[PDB]
Design a protein around this ligand. Structure first.
Ligand SMILES: [Mg+2]
Ligand SMILES: [Mg+2]
Ligand SMILES: [Mg+2]
Ligand SMILES: [Mg+2]
Ligand SMILES: [Mg+2]
Ligand SMILES: [Mg+2]
Ligand SMILES: [Mg+2]
Ligand SMILES: [Mg+2]
Ligand SMILES: [Mg+2]
Ligand SMILES: [Mg+2]
Ligand SMILES: [Mg+2]
Ligand SMILES: [Mg+2]
Ligand SMILES: [Mg+2]
Ligand SMILES: [Mg+2]
Ligand SMILES: [Mg+2]
Ligand SMILES: [Mg+2]
Ligand SMILES: [Mg+2]
Ligand SMILES: [Mg+2]
Ligand SMILES: [Mg+2]
Ligand SMILES: [Mg+2]
Ligand SMILES: [Mg+2]
Ligand SMILES: [Mg+2]
Ligand SMILES: [Mg+2]
Ligand SMILES: [Mg+2]
Ligand SMILES: [Mg+2]
Ligand SMILES: [Mg+2]
Ligand SMILES: [Mg+2]
Ligand SMILES: [Mg+2]
Ligand SMILES: [Mg+2]
Ligand SMILES: [Mg+2]
Ligand SMILES: [Mg+2]
Ligand SMILES: [Mg+2]
Ligand SMILES: [Mg+2]
Ligand SMILES: [Mg+2]
Ligand SMILES: [Mg+2]
Ligand SMILES: [Mg+2]
Ligand SMILES: [Mg+2]
Ligand SMILES: [Mg+2]
Ligand SMILES: [Mg+2]
Ligand SMILES: [Mg+2]
Ligand SMILES: [Mg+2]
Ligand SMILES: [Mg+2]
Ligand SMILES: [Mg+2]
Ligand SMILES: [Mg+2]
Ligand SMILES: [Mg+2]
Ligand SMILES: [Mg+2]
Ligand SMILES: [Mg+2]
Ligand SMILES: [Mg+2]
Ligand SMILES: [Mg+2]
Ligand SMILES: [Mg+2]
Ligand SMILES: [Mg+2]
Ligand SMILES: [Mg+2]
Ligand SMILES: [Mg+2]
Ligand SMILES: [Mg+2]
Ligand SMILES: [Mg+2]
Ligand SMILES: [Mg+2]
Ligand SMILES: [Mg+2]
Lengths: 134, 158, 259
RNA sequence: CGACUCUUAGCGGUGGAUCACUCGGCUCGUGCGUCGAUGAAGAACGCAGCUAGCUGCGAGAAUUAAUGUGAAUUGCAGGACACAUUGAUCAUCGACACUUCGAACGCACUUGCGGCCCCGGGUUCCUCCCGGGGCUACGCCUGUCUGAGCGUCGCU
RNA sequence: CCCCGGAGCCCCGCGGACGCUACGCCGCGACGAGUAGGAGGGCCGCUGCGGUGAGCCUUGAAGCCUAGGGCGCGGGCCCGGGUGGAGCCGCCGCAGGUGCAGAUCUUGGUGGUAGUAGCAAAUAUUCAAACGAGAACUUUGAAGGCCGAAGUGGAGAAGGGUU
RNA sequence: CGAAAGACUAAUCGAACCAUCUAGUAGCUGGUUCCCUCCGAAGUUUCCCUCAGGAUAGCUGGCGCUCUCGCACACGCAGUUU
RNA sequence: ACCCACCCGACCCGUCUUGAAACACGGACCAAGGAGUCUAACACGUGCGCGAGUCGGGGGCUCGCACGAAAGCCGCCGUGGCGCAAUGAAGGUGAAGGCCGGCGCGCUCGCCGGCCGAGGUGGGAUCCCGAGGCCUCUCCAGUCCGCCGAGGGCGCACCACCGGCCCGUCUCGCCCGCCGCGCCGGGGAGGUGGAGCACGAGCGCACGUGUUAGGACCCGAAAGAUGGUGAACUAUGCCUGGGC
RNA sequence: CGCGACCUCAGAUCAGACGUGGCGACCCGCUGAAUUUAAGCAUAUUAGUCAGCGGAGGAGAAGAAACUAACCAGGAUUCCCUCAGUAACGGCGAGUGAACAGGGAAGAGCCCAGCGCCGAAUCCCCGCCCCGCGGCGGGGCGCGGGACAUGUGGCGUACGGAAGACCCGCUCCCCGGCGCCGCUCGUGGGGGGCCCAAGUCCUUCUGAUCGAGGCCCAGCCCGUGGACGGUGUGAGGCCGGUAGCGGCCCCCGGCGCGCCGGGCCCGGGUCUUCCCGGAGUCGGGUUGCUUGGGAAUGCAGCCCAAAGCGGGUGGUAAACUCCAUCUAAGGCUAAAUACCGGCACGAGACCGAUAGUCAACAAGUACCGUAAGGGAAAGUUGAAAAGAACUUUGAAGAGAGAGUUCAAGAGGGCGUGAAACCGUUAAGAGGUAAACGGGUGGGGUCCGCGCAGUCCGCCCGGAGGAUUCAACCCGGCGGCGGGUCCGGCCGUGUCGGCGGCCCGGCGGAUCUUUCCCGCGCGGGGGACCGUCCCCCGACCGGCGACCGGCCGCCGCCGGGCGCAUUUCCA
């Protein structure tokens, strides 16, 4: 259960919170898991997906073991566009098909300074909890 | 129209009463709020009784109640005078004082002096500074209790 | 429903003589809502017949002995495997029905322990059946935060939480009670009498101190004892084919004289 | 058989019931309990690269600064930026800013007429002229200055 | 002059239904109009809640439609097929904004009336051409007509507000 | 307001219009939602500023209780008659 | 169950009405909506708990409430309500009687010892006792078991009647009492008013029906009241223009 | 005829301050109806209610007795429960209607004028310096102004107070700063930020799964986390969260210690001598409203108009008289209490687009009205726009093919798509309008058959094949039932232990103060009674409350039994 008497557990409230979410908050919502490979290395479950990570689509039609680079992040549409994840429209023009970030797995991160410091913060909290549990 | 037998009864719902219906959906929320506020006040008045001050014994009025005895509002001045507590100070040691109480009979007076005497025996006056002057009790009766007294202080039992 | 609901219009009846129908109709304007139908419980817009009030007598208060009688009745039938099995609880492989346990079970701080316990005691197959029941609710309570529904599981009466109520918490189905604060809403859910519980020896001792045996007061509920029984020999089959009674009955006329 | 009419069924229309959804209501509760001449509420008129409405803002006008965040915004364009840099985008909001009416204040409501001090062009204080700036409501209190009275006195 | 773990049974007292949801099951008689009105029973029906069905459901829920198959005195119900595309029901309790033909009822929709009434105030149109997919109606030219300077002309006021 | 018609006062005048008191009151019209089963009326009484309504008797239903004995072994009651 | 045929039957519903197929009203058709509710108070019935009691509120103690604004507990458990006592306008008063023996003159009156203790008549479900049968494969003896049972009893509830007691009231009477002897206080007999007593039945909770007060089954006036908006139409006055 | 004091008055765009409007759920002061009820109506009622005006605050108002009572007396205000639908009012009709006591929530008490003493000992504003400065303050210094004796400040206010003499005991309280230490209850106060468990495991359905089966214990893994939401269906483990006395960073609060700057020489009792109270107010008369308040509950106007052992109250007018009880005509005060407005949250046996707010949407919008005001309708393609390229007919709208989609029998007002009503297709009928009830017939539509439906099941008899056993013992296991209650555990009624009784506790208006402790009372012992527990023996219900042996019976497994038995099959 949730016991904190200031959170909500109220369909209408959670959905309204979700759909009318502000960009910086959507960043967090649009997170996606690391590959087991990276999960081992960084000590981090998942990361906020970003403009030019390398990525697999895990479920759907485009479900496949190819590793496409991310193309853009349409936070309004809760979606990311990926390199070869696309479909030919009526008149031949390719159109980047949206995939939801959570149905995707990050194989290669785009590491900047800030992304580096984020991973350092998440790994540290994870190991504090393991120390507290032990 | 009345039909065969019944109390010829007068209800008072002729004014606009539904405009002034007072529901009680508060009450649980209220009861808690009081209770929190109560526990806070205890914690503020740290070793002092949660109760309040000590209050006198007093008989009720009228032939009806007469036989029973309650807590009164505060100890009279004669009762403080005889016990030998300066009225202005008595407030500072948790002794209720009203000054509007007469004192008719000497049976009610000596009882209420006895109360204050007993109070003064089983009271633990802390000194003003941690450095200990007169009046202020020993650090024994201080360490062994900086304890609050739950419930009414020296309760009256008829 | 709101006070103003339905009456926020100003609408007069066009009286008779206009054909139409003597309803109050919205006054004036160049809208669709003009000369319509206001106030009437029948009209669109309108005003529900006998709008619901807040001061409906919601709460309902019950005599204290009666409340206790119910709670004794539920306890008494938490024994009786039949009444527990009939109430659905898969109590087939459980070792003894007023199921009481060691008081390390106060100790446990992890679900891990609490589940392992339930599997040794063979009470897990109730929890298993709770998982099996988890499904979506039928209808409008879905859109009002009652979306999922399931079974009631093993009760677990404890005497003191030394950690226990944390341990049994995520295990779906389980409700934890104090002995000193029992509840008929939980001991007889659905107003239905049986329910598999799991006692802690400390708690299971305390029951007689709470409720009082037949020749001893409650000693914890001031002035109380058990309710006395109306009839003692419940098995009437043992009565009716006794020597004492069948001695004194005419022989049963049983021929069938048809027309 | 013929047309037409009636009935039933199939399929198609018309129409939007039903069912299923719900970023809305309705009710009960909790905490706090804050507007204004330092110009409120309310109104007006403005402001977007393409924008009418809703919203958001005020000539610094879909916002400036700051702090937090850490790559977008995205209908299309265009762009920026080096996202190893105060740094996109959101959020917060303590600095800055805040057109005109409005208690509404120079006097009027035409958006009309003014007065008084200072500044720039205009002069070379020559007042004009133009532009900018600052004052110019009523009531009232504490003081201040100037006064009034065959009001009550004193000295001359 | 004996025992039913065996008389063999139309009566069996040694143990007892195929039957016994004892709110069950069974037998005999009698009777059955009904407004207003009253009461009982509804395994009749609607929506939500606690219980409960190791219920049902993308291998197709709800709803909808059906010259298909049935049940019930009836309220109603169950199955088949179609359509649909995401939830829904049985039982035990509790709860109610719970069942429509009517209210010159309310809101929305649709007919017959009906291709009917009707498109009749103020004399008037015709020929050719152009454009154009297309001309009774546009435009140009030609003719014939009217308003007849108290104008069907030429300019404002108010009002409109971009006409 | 009226040289007077109760005329006119924004299609409204023998008392304008708007919002509220207001869901104003109504012994009077109208309507009042599923099935089976069982029982089943009254339009007469007295009183009423009562006569298109109430009250009160009556007539109806429901709940019962107390007894009775077809369990070879009955008292009481009647829209009769003697 | 779809269509068609034929014989017989068969006027359109709703409604008010003594009477509706009516030349009585409402109704073109379909969908959705749509009217005996809730609160309070009373009464009776029923179900449950406890019972001369019962009670839960209000308050408090136990939790951040996930379920909890629940659940539990309280010398508050009873301040208090209702109930356990009436009757009188009130001052007030306030439900026991009998018997026996003795002492006062047994005076159907006054005082002292013992015993029983809510009176009696009729009817009363039911219990209880039971003469006597009625047999047993024989003549008698004879405990055991029934079945019935004439006859006789205790008699619940309830009913009818008669007694009795309490309060009010009247009438008539004769005595008692003492810190205060008094315009003091107390009793008796016989009527008569009382929503009385005469070995208790209530309290709380729940459902039902009925009756009310509330918008009170739903729809409906003509009106009434408070506070505001309009003389752009029109009525009349005035100012300033125009026209014949 | 001047100059100077003061008094009363003006004027300043004089210096510096304040007030004005809004909101209005709650609150305070006025004002104040009528529908309505009374079955009519006028008093009454509706109601001191709606509308009207005024003014506030986070609450307001009230409040420290000119009180209750009549007691063995209580002791400010507010709130709840009760008092109580009571006392009372009332065309004594309809109807209306309090208070005290009692129990709670809370709890807090104070200050002037006066009377007096003190060189006005007081206040405001200037100006210079040091600190402090986003709630203009401290300290110092100025012959720098003014207020003030028509009275400022200290002491002091009815609970008495002052001044005096000696009885006693001793001396911390406050603020302006500047630091510093412990982050100080939802279990680290408040705010902000950023963080923290576990499957996308194997098969398989599907357009897509979050489904279905499985996975070292219902299956794997976490579980202080199986709330909720999102993600192409239904997800504890995909993502955000959720749990946690979990983490880190900011900021702010609140309280603890140190230093400085100031202020501050601040008691009590005992005896004496003095001191003491709010006027056009009380009170009366009155008229009008108001109240349950009745020969006047409260408020008013007008007239009269006080006193000081007075005055007020003491619920029936007055006189006499005793008692009781307060101390009016000046003021401040937190708390429990209220809250349909606001900001910010949480929840629901509520509504689910004719509902729920007028309003799920560009709604107080469009639109109407001169104006006050009135006031709608209107949600849904799909998982994704993949929103139909291209070919062709047409001036075009419209089509026909093609394509996308799981589907366009989802085509931009597009989920589902009822009925009325219409078009057509098929079938059937047709001069008494249609339609209907009952009864048959004919035709259709499908549905069940049968390409014999002769339907199964027992038992038996026969003829064919078939494996293994029943019967019988033997060994093992399990179950039932039984009495000898045999032996022991188990428990009901009784009796014995007075044995638990102090190693058995509660309760009691039983007793005792021979006891103890604390102040005749409280607490604890100590007797006593009632109730609940140990020891063994005896009798009895030997009770579903169990064990152990023995018996009898049953069943299963395994041995043996080979075929006049044993099942199977046709
Ligand atoms: Mg208290
Ligand atoms: Mg509505
Ligand atoms: Mg449904
Ligand atoms: Mg058709
Ligand atoms: Mg619609
Ligand atoms: Mg019948
Ligand atoms: Mg009927
Ligand atoms: Mg869907
Ligand atoms: Mg409802
Ligand atoms: Mg209809
Ligand atoms: Mg024509
Ligand atoms: Mg022109
Ligand atoms: Mg009129
Ligand atoms: Mg109505
Ligand atoms: Mg009438
Ligand atoms: Mg009957
Ligand atoms: Mg009539
Ligand atoms: Mg007639
Ligand atoms: Mg008819
Ligand atoms: Mg006729
Ligand atoms: Mg009529
Ligand atoms: Mg008609
Ligand atoms: Mg309907
Ligand atoms: Mg009853
Ligand atoms: Mg009645
Ligand atoms: Mg009603
Ligand atoms: Mg009306
Ligand atoms: Mg009138
Ligand atoms: Mg104001
Ligand atoms: Mg009337
Ligand atoms: Mg009337
Ligand atoms: Mg009238
Ligand atoms: Mg009144
Ligand atoms: Mg008002
Ligand atoms: Mg105040
Ligand atoms: Mg006072
Ligand atoms: Mg009081
Ligand atoms: Mg009462
Ligand atoms: Mg009144
Ligand atoms: Mg003075
Ligand atoms: Mg989901
Ligand atoms: Mg989930
Ligand atoms: Mg996670
Ligand atoms: Mg009055
Ligand atoms: Mg008197
Ligand atoms: Mg005050
Ligand atoms: Mg809609
Ligand atoms: Mg709709
Ligand atoms: Mg709506
Ligand atoms: Mg819909
Ligand atoms: Mg739609
Ligand atoms: Mg729809
Ligand atoms: Mg489809
Ligand atoms: Mg579709
Ligand atoms: Mg559609
Ligand atoms: Mg849809
Ligand atoms: Mg045909």
């Amino acid at each position: 259960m949730k016991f904190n008497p200031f959170v909500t557990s109220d369909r209408s409230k959670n959905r309204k919170r979700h759909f009318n979410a502000p960009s910086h908050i959507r960043r967090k919502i649009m997170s996606s898991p690391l590959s087991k490979e990276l999960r081992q290395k960084y000590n981090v479950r998942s990361m906020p997906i970003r403009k030019d990570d390398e990525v697999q689509v895990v479920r759907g039609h485009y479900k496949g073991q190819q590793i496409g680079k991310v193309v853009q992040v349409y936070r309004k549409k809760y979606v990311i566009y990926i390199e070869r994840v696309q479909r030919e429209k009526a008149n031949g023009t390719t159109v980047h098909v949206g995939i939801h970030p959570s149905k995707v797995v990050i194989t290669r991160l785009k590491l900047d300074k800030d992304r580096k410091k984020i991973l350092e913060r998440k790994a540290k909290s994870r190991q504090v909890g393991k120390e507290k549990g032990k | 129209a009345p039909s065969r037998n019944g109390m010829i009864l007068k209800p008072h719902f002729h004014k606009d009463w539904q405009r002034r219906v007072a529901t009680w959906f508060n009450q649980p929320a209220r009861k808690i709020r009081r209770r929190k506020a109560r526990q806070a006040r205890a914690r503020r008045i740290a070793p002092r009784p949660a109760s309040g001050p000590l209050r006198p014994i007093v008989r009720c009025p009228t032939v009806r109640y007469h036989t029973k005895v309650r807590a009164g509002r505060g100890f009279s001045l004669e009762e403080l005078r005889v016990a030998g507590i300066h009225k202005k100070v008595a407030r500072t040691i948790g002794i209720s004082v009203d000054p509007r109480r007469r004192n008719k009979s000497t049976e009610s007076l000596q009882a209420n002096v006895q109360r204050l005497k007993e109070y003064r025996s089983k009271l633990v006056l802390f000194p003003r500074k941690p450095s200990a002057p007169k009046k202020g009790d020993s650090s024994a009766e201080e360490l062994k209790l900086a304890t609050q007294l739950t419930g009414p202080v020296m309760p009256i039992r008829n | 429903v709101s006070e103003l609901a339905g009456h926020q219009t100003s609408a007069e009846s066009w009286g008779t003589g206009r054909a139409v129908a003597r309803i109050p109709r919205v006054r004036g304007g160049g809208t669709h809502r003009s000369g319509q139908g206001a106030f009437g419980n029948m009209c669109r817009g309108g005003r529900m017949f006998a709008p619901t009030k807040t001061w409906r007598r919601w709460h309902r208060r019950v005599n204290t002995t009666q409340k206790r009688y119910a709670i004794c009745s539920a306890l008494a039938a938490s024994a009786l495997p039949a009444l527990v099995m009939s109430k659905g609880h898969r109590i087939e492989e459980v070792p003894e029905l007023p199921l009481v346990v060691e008081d390390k079970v106060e100790g446990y701080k992890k679900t891990k322990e609490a589940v392992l316990l339930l599997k040794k005691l063979k009470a897990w197959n109730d929890i298993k059946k709770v998982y099996a029941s988890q499904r979506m609710r039928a209808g409008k309570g879905k859109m009002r935060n009652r979306r999922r529904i399931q079974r009631r599981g093993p009760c677990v009466i404890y005497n003191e939480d030394n950690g226990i109520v944390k341990a049994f918490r995520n295990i779906p189905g389980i409700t934890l009670l104090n002995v000193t604060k029992l509840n008929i809403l939980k001991l007889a859910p659905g107003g239905h009498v049986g329910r598999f519980c799991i006692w802690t020896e400390s708690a299971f001792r305390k029951l007689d101190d709470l409720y009082g045996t037949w020749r001893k007061a409650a000693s914890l509920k001031s002035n109380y004892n058990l309710p006395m029984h109306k009839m003692l020999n419940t098995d009437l089959s043992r009565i009716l084919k006794s020597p004492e009674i069948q001695r004194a009955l005419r022989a049963p006329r049983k021929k069938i004289h048809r027309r």
